[PDB]
């Protein structure tokens, strides 16, 4: 066990009290804030119709991409009604994973559609726009429960 | 819903456990009273600077202070202070009824003080002295009438707190409310002691 490299201390309860130097930021996501906001809109109210928690995993998912995608979906708050799109640009590999609750709601058909949209966007040379397009396509595919 | 999420006997309890820690209502009311003391300080400064500027006869010829109606009102205010203190003594206990009785008689004596002050004002205006009339009249009326507004606010507090005691179980929070109202009334009668001594005795 070890807190952040510097300036973060474990408090009395579970919550960790972390810090950053005055100059730098905290989120550190390598994307413009505008596109992060757009993807947030796609996931939040671009998905309400789906009533299925939509998740995006830009990190690397190595080995058998499918099994690691399942494991990552396990990290979503409600993996049973959840659609997770995990893309590794190091491996150029997309995966989409769902749960037992999202079954027969059009998720299966929208799976290849979302994957194809993400792949087309990535080959065109833009990860985030592919993420947003795939989220939109899958969300429109999944009818509310 | 089973029994309760917060094991409290009343929807409102004392803002602090006054046994070991200060009672915030008492502290706040004391601080505010200390500020109202400076308000009355501004009033007293007005009256005193007017006093310094009179030609040796500070109560003008038309004005003649009436001690006959002035001593009884200050005595009644002192008595109301004492009855408010016994109302507090009842309040510290569970006796909401004793608190109500003592505060009712205190309210009656404060109302009598207000009516006596109004009658003395009527006598004074009828015999010349008047706020637009003279500097003494204006400073005296301003000081005593602002104190009278304070007394009327204290009467409002008395009636409001008696209603509050009617509408809920007497709890240490209501006891605290009674103590702070008593603090305010004691401040009111203290500033009256000062005002009566300066206006009537010291002159």
């Amino acid at each position: 066990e070890l807190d952040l490299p510097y300036g973060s201390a474990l408090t009395s309860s579970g919550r960790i009290s972390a810090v950053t130097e005055p100059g730098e930021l905290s989120v550190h996501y390598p994307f413009p804030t505008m596109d992060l906001v757009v993807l947030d809109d796609a996931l939040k109210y671009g998905s309400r119709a789906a009533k299925a928690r939509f998740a995006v995993y830009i990190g690397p998912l190595g080995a058998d991409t499918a099994a690691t995608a399942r494991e990552i979906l396990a990290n979503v708050p409600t993996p049973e009604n959840a659609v997770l799109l995990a893309v590794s640009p190091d491996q150029r590999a997309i995966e989409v994973v769902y749960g037992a609750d999202v079954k027969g709601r059009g998720i299966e058909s929208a799976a290849p559609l979302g994957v194809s949209a993400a792949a087309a966007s990535f080959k065109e040379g833009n990860l985030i726009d592919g993420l947003i397009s795939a989220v939109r396509v899958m969300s429109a595919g999944v009818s509310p429960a | 819903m089973t029994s309760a999420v917060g094991t409290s006997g009343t929807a409102i309890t004392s803002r602090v456990h006054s046994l070991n820690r200060p009672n915030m209502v008492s502290v706040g009311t004391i601080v505010w009273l200390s500020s109202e003391l400076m308000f009355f300080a501004g009033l007293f400064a007005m009256y005193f600077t007017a006093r310094a500027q009179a030609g040796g006869a500070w109560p003008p010829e038309p004005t003649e202070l009436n001690l006959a109606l002035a001593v009884p009102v200050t005595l009644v205010l002192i008595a109301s202070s004492f009855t408010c203190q016994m109302g507090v003594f009842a309040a510290e206990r569970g006796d909401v009824f004793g608190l109500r009785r003592w505060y009712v008689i205190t309210f009656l004596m404060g109302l009598f003080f207000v009516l006596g002050q109004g009658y003395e004002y009527i006598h004074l205006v009828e015999h010349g002295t008047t706020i637009p009339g003279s500097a003494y009249g204006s400073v005296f009326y301003l000081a005593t009438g602002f104190h009278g507004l304070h007394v009327i606010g204290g009467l409002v507090a008395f009636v409001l707190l008696l209603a509050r005691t009617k509408m809920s179980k007497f709890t240490p929070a209501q006891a605290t409310a009674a103590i702070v109202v008593s603090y305010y009334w004691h401040f009111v009668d203290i500033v009256w002691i000062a005002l009566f001594a300066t206006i009537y005795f010291v002159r």
Binding site: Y45, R48 | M1, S3, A4
Partner: protein, 42 residues
Amino acid sequence: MSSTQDRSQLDPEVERHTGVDVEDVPSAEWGWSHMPIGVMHI
């Protein structure tokens, strides 16, 4: 404690499927909750 949960069965009748959503207006299905943006702009 001194209260009982209420069960309200009211007749519903557009179906509210399009327009506003309960996430934005928590009582969307309990009554008129959506003014079209076009009418507001006009």
